[PDB]
Amino acid sequence: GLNLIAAHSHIRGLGVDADTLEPRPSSQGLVGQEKARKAAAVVLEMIKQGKIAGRAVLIAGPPSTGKTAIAMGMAQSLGQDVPFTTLAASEIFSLEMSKTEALTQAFRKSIGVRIKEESEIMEGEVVEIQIDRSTGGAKQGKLTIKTTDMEAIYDMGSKMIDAMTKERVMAGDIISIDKSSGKITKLGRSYARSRDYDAMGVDTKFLQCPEGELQKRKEVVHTVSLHEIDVINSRTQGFLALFSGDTGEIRSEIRDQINTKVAEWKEEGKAEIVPGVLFIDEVHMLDIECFSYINRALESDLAPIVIMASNRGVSRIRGTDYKSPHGLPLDFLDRVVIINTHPYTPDELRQILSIRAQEEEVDLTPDALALLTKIGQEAGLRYASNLITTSQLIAAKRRAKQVGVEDVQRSFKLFYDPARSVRFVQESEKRLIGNDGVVDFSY
Amino acid sequence: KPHRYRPGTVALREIRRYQKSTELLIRKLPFQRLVREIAQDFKTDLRFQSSAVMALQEACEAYLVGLFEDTNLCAIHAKRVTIMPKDIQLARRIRGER
């Protein structure tokens, strides 16, 4: 389909026993990281429980230790029930809006308003449309519709006859009509009428007739974020800015009104509030102004849980000239609990490579998996994982059905790991342009 | 003052004319269009031989003439000189056809 194979495609969940929060040694595509997966499952529990507002969790650990994987596992194990916003900290440096406004919109995106509504929908195969069009139009007309179980005829009001002519509704068309709006969606063409569709090309699909009653109440559970309500109220087609962007800085008094109205809908029981998650990937790309805003945004009642990942050690905080752990100011780190991801053992690398060799269509011979595991220890999990794809392409060039050691060796030879790449750089320092701008082009 | 026959005189003259004759009583071109109109709903770009539609007039006129005879017996069984739609409906239903 349109989803290709990607680095996280094998993550199907968090891999944790829902009855106990005990992490299984591997399941759902996660291997090891058990203590970190247990902690993320405790966070996941209190996300679903909703009662706790504006807690922040940092996932801290060396690169490739599964920090994004655990974040993706939580997203896959929340699903559609809960809003889940992913933010790269690079994204808030907008030219359209100040970074605290961009960071406000991200918090607003992570609270859902859940609204349950009904409508009568009429659905069936058109047996006939008669419209007289009697000079003017839409004067009178009759609609006959059937399911497999019923047939009925309807006199149409003139603004429904406009809708029918607008949708060029024809005998044999399978339609749904939302009655209160009066919009007509043509779900398809009935197969029994196929010969009447003389203009439709042979690529055309056909359907069986709808089943049961022509009319029923269908109930829709909408979830709309606070950000969407904010943007809708900004201007006469405010929602249109939810797509193009081109929201300005939305005025604070609009948000304050909406917070009051959503509290009214909750107290009236018309709507429910569904707190989600905001995940801030590589949070150390934020600067000191951002962290000062976050500190108090977290104290709002309508704050999501915020989950964060950092590769950084004791490192320079952006927008200042001093250093702190994770690159995050201590006053912000006081508001945050930290989950640590550790490096992998060789057998866990073997399992992750095996999983990645299942997610791509690759057969690894047992010695090729052993060699990739050895390369994984020596050159890192990500590099060996990229040798899987490379080896399959080399094997296919030699038309082999399984990837052999010869293919992994060609991969290791053709594509350098980060350390050999650095060693190549440290040898070529006269040919590579230095930090001084100096370079020699002679042989 | 011009003559005028009694109600039922020319009906009998018409019966005695059409039971004596064999020529077809439905008009040709109006029946061709009915056949082609019906055929369109089964398959586009069909053709009919002239003999195929003329064979098909002869079949259906005989069906209608034969049905009217059965309905006329249903009328006179109701002691009516006048055939009515429920006579058609009775005749076909006895025939297993309605």
Ligand SMILES: Nc1ncnc2c1ncn2[C@@H]1O[C@H](COP(=O)(O)OP(=O)(O)O)[C@@H](O)[C@H]1O
């Ligand atoms: N415990 C694990 N189980 C399964 N796959 C993992 C695990 N840890 C890392 N990976 C995979 O290895 C790759 C690198 O890990 P990643 O989560 O990107 O590390 P980080 O985000 O800390 O750099 C990703 O494709 C990820 O899916």
